Amino acid sequence: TNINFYKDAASSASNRQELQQDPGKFTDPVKDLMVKTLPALN
Amino acid sequence: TNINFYKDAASSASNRQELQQDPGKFTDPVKDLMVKTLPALN
Amino acid sequence: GVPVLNTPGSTQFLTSDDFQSPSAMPQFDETPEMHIPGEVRNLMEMAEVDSVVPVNNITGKTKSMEAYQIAVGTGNTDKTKPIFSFQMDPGYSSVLKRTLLGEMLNYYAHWSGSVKLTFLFCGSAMATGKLLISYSPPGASVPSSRKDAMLGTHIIWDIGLQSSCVLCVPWISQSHYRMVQQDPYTSAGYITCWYQTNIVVPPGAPTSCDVLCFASACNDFSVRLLRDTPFMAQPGKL
Amino acid sequence: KTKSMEAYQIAVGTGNTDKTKPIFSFQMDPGYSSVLKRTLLGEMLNYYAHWSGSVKLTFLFCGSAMATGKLLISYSPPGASVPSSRKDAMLGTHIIWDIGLQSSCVLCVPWISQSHYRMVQQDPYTSAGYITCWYQTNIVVPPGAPTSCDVLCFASACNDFSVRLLRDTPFMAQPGKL
Amino acid sequence: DRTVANTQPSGPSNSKEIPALTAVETGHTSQVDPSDTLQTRHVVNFHSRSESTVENFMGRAACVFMDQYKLNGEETSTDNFAVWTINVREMAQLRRKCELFTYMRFDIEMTMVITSCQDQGTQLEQDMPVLTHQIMYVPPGGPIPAKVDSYEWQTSTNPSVFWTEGNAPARMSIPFISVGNAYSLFYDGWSHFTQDGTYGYTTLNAMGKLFVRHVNKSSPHQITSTIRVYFKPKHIKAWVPRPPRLCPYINKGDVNFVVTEVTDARKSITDTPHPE
Amino acid sequence: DRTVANTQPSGPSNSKEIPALTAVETGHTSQVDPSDTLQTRHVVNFHSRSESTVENFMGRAACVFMDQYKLNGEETSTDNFAVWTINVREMAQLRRKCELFTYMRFDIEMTMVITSCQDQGTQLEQDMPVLTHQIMYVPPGGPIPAKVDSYEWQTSTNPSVFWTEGNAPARMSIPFISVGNAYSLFYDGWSHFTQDGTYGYTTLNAMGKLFVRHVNKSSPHQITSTIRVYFKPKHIKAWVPRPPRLCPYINKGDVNFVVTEVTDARKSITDTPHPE
Amino acid sequence: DRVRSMTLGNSTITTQESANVVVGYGEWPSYLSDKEATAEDQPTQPDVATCRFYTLESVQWEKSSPGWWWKFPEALKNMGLFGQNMHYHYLGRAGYTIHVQCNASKFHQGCLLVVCVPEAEMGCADTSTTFPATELTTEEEPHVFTSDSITGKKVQAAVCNAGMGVGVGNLTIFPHQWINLRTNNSATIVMPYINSVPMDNMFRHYNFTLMIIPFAPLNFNEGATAYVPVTVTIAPMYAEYNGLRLASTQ
Amino acid sequence: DRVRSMTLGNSTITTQESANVVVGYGEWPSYLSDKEATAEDQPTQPDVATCRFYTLESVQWEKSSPGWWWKFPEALKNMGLFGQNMHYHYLGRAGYTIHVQCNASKFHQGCLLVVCVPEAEMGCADTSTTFPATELTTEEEPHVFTSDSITGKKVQAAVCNAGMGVGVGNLTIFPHQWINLRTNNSATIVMPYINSVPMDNMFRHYNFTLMIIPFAPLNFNEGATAYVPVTVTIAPMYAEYNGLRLASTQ
Amino acid sequence: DRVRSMTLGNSTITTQESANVVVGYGEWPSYLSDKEATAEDQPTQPDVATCRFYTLESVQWEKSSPGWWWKFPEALKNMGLFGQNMHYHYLGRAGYTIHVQCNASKFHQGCLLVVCVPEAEMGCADTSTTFPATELTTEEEPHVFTSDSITGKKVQAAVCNAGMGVGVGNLTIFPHQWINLRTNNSATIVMPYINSVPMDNMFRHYNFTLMIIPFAPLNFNEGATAYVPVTVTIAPMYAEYNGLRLASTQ
Amino acid sequence: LSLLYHLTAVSSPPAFWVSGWLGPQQYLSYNSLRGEAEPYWEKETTDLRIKEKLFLEAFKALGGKGPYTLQGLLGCELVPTAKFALNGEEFMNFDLKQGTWGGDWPEALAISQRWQQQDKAANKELTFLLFSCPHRLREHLERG
């Protein structure tokens, strides 16, 4: 499966196995860390 | 035969070679061991 | 690229092939597998389970609960006559078919291994008797007397505290595997039950008791050739 | 109220009228529930056939700073009817939101599904519960503050949330060539 | 491949050990071998049960969907595409095998043996190019085609396979598409929590629909193609086995049945089919 | 394949820690799990999100181009070849998936499921050999065919694939053909620097045209082939995700839309579809 | 051994002639594991409030009785805190120890297949239609099989088959314990939580059916006790409950 | 601190202006110890089914409102699994965290003594007789004090006194938290299980009364919210339950 | 924290009730890297001349206001040296810190989704045609959404949708900060340079739209300030500029 | 105008009858006993026979033995409109996107699944609503 039969990188398979995520980009985008337990404002 | 040509696990071959069985699940389901030689009840 | 020759057996949908295939949903996250109790990994594990045998195929008695009950009675009448008599082959014998062992075999074409017929007494606790159940290997006719029955393989069941004595029939097949279908060659023997002693019952106990036969499979039991079951015979679209 | 900005605003008011009546009431399934669909979580689920994981419903108060109250938002697991009183709501899973400096208390609904994954489509089996909001205490406002305030619900997903089976979204239903 | 257990050597026994005398009332099938109740010989048995596993028993691919979808003119209707709410129940041959077990976790190979035959007619002179067939699996809840030329055939996210007639049948390994951890071949519960609604397996294991069509827009004369979807359940993790179905199947949504005899009737309890 | 985070065990809490009480005004989605706001049990969750990645979400191949190009006689016209300015927008199914993200860097598998059907006519007696189809991707700015037999079909440098009907659909992995470092699924700017001209994605990500034709010169009777180009975006590096499109698409050049309701209307704010 | 004692919760079951306890498929009941869990609602685990033998209504074993079937998670509705938690929780997992007590004298003949069949999807008497819930689930009384074929918009309770269109005598593949009045005065089947999903609604989903099918009809000579009951007690050990919400109107 | 969060059971209480949490007499609630136990019935301990904030009916703070009192173990009858276990168990021990939420704007004047008085034995309006249970325990509505002396066969709800014939302003010896609309939008009193016996019937015995007595009547100028409610939520943490039996007809 | 100070360039923004600063997708703005660069024109980097908060025209939040949208690189044309460098440079990269100040008293109700949507390609009121640039880009005044559907050769400013044919309430996927007058007197969204190409023309390309959409309409009782403005200040930190040439006639 | 077939059927009766209204005027009066679309007509008769079979299977789908007066308002407004009512109360609607009936009512899901069991019945409904109803509406408007 990992073997690539074509020299072109665009010819490789879909990177289905690659599970990466950074929800902090969109779900925690604030500059200052907002802890769930701590009050968010003041 | 064992070689998998697709990254997906659902794409693999049928596990025909895998011969496993636990007949004690259905043929010997009693909580207390019942020996064939010994009387089953009392 | 690499020179490849299309060998015979190409562009074909063999039903019994283990070829790989591209998935419809790549990198699909399957639901995590929980330990569900009852993991059946071999169909013979299901066959190995004692399963009540509809021994009494008599018309009307079938499609009912009288099919499984072998009527064993307290009397002098027909006590030199078989309590029951059928063929040992779970595949095509009307008695041993349509049960866990029989329907398990019907999904295959060749079967092997010893069959355990567990005979459970269903009567009064005061009832006591002896039933001689015999598996006769093929080569002769079905046993017609208990004398002809004890010659072959037989078990004498003393009705009592256990009351579930099992005739574990042996593997006396000429070939390694018998035929599930009705084949005169490599066929099995015959199971016939007789009254070793009459089941004596007290006046308060019922005279006519019952026996339930349980077809199961041993650790030696196996099947070889898969096939579609003839039982279903689907008429059309559902 | 839909096809507008009144669709998102939950009108929470200062009054004695219908304060034993739900502030809002819908079904928890983001897939086929008309309320929780057509949003990031709902439209994300609509692109799949099986979904799982806890849904966080963040309730943001949009009113005067002087306004103060308590709203009890309850997720009721399936098996019974939709909550019709706050007494029936507090029996299930509920969160009491004290309107104040935070004013964005979130009902992070749990995963009480019988199966590992629920169905995105309208399936009576393995369906989710119901979200109903009630007035724990009436939102008391000063005379200078407006009586009728608003609430915005934010559907989001937790670290436990996942979907399993990809499918084409039923929302689009392309008529023809563009 | 572990073989069957060899029949251990045995001799005459008058001991107090009662192998035959047991109690099946306990729910335990007696584990006695022929040696236990009979005097037998030591035979090294090599009868492997490899083909008798649920993996191999379900490995045989059996047809599950038979429908006739048509190519004809421009009067597009519902007969130009074959619709199937993917369910094993449709065809009884594999339905009985699957209904031999309550729960089965498996990846399912879906092979589409499309057979295109021109419909008998007054005029069959047409010489159509090789027909291409699209087999799309619509995820449960996803949009489904309304016509043979609808937008839903543009498979942006729905899995699909385009197969040209004359090649190997299109085989697609569908993964474990279930909300739960198994497929409930039997579901004794109901669809809704109020003990109402749909009853049976149909409520759970709601596999998404499968739509089959001719990628070719039209045909001078009508040609009917039989999709003949065959299922090969592999990677079987079957749980809770069930007896093979006795009564013939009547409906693909329920196990509703017309009462059938337990087994083939025989003349008498002492009737043995034997040579004279 | 990293699974979801397991729900940590929790108990009754009267602390000054307010997990539920947060501020979504800050633009931060609350990171609370069910344990944070409720008393829950320790369950080891194995619900993998592998199929929920942009690589897998876009991995599903969906149709992007539907056109009917024809083979007939010697009166060559514009109907003998299918022209497509390669754009995801054409078909809404994949257009919505791509317009779920502002920028996506990916290699795009282009699968041509050609379906040739003879056009219904008085005379269909023809017996044409197996039709061969040429699918050429003209680079942006390169010469494009004017007729089905023009010089541009002589692909000296333009990529092209010749596919014979009945084989596997022609799958060609087009690389990242973009002047920029990503594909702008949305382009809020204009075509020209004077804030005029064409508006939308069409100005940038100017993928070169795709021309499909029958390599066979002519056919005794007209045969219409549906090209049905399906796109499989792989090697996805999507940036700036966007909400899935709400209003139905009207044009493939702009996001111009007829206003649609935010969501399905319901009787009342307290209306819950529930069993009685 | 014949004598046995099971102490689950407040209730205690004592037997003197019971056969060996059957554990459903050899897996002892246990709480849903975190690795096997799908919900993060912190399920409540009443060790004795819900995990106790609830005695169902006694059913008389008649000479013409075809059999009976109880849908266990459902039968226990409105019967103690197990039923209360069924009403108040969307999800539910439990391993049920079913002790069926059918006591009879030494002069009574008969044997019952007391088989716990997981997801025993029953058939309808009229195959085209589907029976209502009042025909499957116990409604003030256990549902009783029929000796021959029956019609109408009811469950196909023909004891001829297992009720699912399958051979009744083949039901022993599922965990079972025969009540042979010669040997067994009771049957003990310990079924673990058996379902595809980690947890399911206990009203929406019927986890299994306790089918008590007399294969040999109860035959007793005159003077013996005609009223031979078949009591059913079931202890839902490890009765986990997720998705706490308002009580269902069941 | 003003802001606070209490996560007991399924329910969660968030406050922004609440004062410091009061623990009743400084002892945090806990399960009955074996050394301190008197019953050997293996009590059930629902950690979240019963230990959760049950929101009682909102009570409007009026300008002429004298006050109110709830009998806590009793008020929570037929309200969730805590009330169900009250019905189904003879004995019961629980430590109640009472969060009374009385939100008001910065232009509202008033202060409430929200005092949890253990065994607040109330007096009768006619001293010779004794009031019925419908006068002490909440009956579809909390019981309301009276500004002056009252007569009849009812509870002496004269807010002049504490209700036990004692000074109301001296009630602060018992655990309390004043709801001053200037400072407190809510009061949090964590009363442990406070009783002479290790466990007592939750219907027969009223463990305590939550007396909410406005010492300064709610005064607000016109235009401000007239309906200023006083909601009562109570979480019975460590709700132990012995003597499981049939449900009481309460 | 509520209080905050941002000192970018000459201008300084002080807030007392602002919520937490949002960084667009978690990436702080920075100059185009040499590895990420495509042009070799040695771009000029005015650290304070262009990277400063430009205050846009104040917009009154009305009770019937549907919303507004600014195209940021474009809105800042002819407004300081940032606009001058936009005119004089073909390429341009900048990370914009948008502080939207909407101050209101404690008696004002409402909340604004102040969302920065990169490449928010708007739809046209007449779908067949395409709107002119005078309808998208701010022209002496910010462009205002419409409560219902509108027609004509203009931008489809129906506030019913997000303006791109998408759900407006789903816009929070893009970096955003809600101006809730209860909590937020201002919103701070720090968007990095978000584009497919390393650099693009700031007039030809609109990098993003600042959509300020009141989800709850501003409701205030009489006597309170009717004119509640929504000022927009934007600081293009790291305002790189390649392709220096003659000034564009914009 | 708005075409609306008022489908109606009774489990225990005129077992099934349709009232097609092209606008406020009624133009079609189909009956189960006649089996024909009594006021092109052959196709509408076949479609309404399919609808009659679907209604009979829906009657079989309901577990209750009580009377069930199923109704529906199938048609397109020139937009398809599908609203099914059980016992005079709306219980399910046909989702065109998912292309299947459903609703909060349990009987809604029972009837939807039962009709889904029928071969291509959901797509027959899709063709009837999205294509056949507007086609008949336009044809009748041009004709009348």
UniProtKB/Swiss-Prot annotation, chain J:
The gene is FCGRT. Belongs to the immunoglobulin superfamily. Residues 1-67 are annotated as: Alpha-1. Disulfide bonds join C76-C133. FcRn complex consists of two subunits: p51, and p14 which is equivalent to beta-2-microglobulin. It forms an MHC class I-like heterodimer. Interacts with albumin/ALB; this interaction regulates ALB homeostasis. (Microbial infection) Interacts with Echovirus 6, Echovirus 11 and Echovirus 30 capsid protein VP1. It comes from Homo sapiens. Cell surface receptor that transfers passive humoral immunity from the mother to the newborn. Binds to the Fc region of monomeric immunoglobulin gamma and mediates its selective uptake from milk. IgG in the milk is bound at the apical surface of the intestinal epithelium. The resultant FcRn-IgG complexes are transcytosed across the intestinal epithelium and IgG is released from FcRn into blood or tissue fluids. Throughout life, contributes to effective humoral immunity by recycling IgG and extending its half-life in the circulation. (Microbial infection) Acts as an uncoating receptor for a panel of echoviruses including Echovirus 5, 6, 7, 9, 11, 13, 25 and 29. It is found in: Cell membrane; Endosome membrane. Residues 68-144 are annotated as: Alpha-2. This is IgG receptor FcRn large subunit p51. It comes from the Eukaryota.
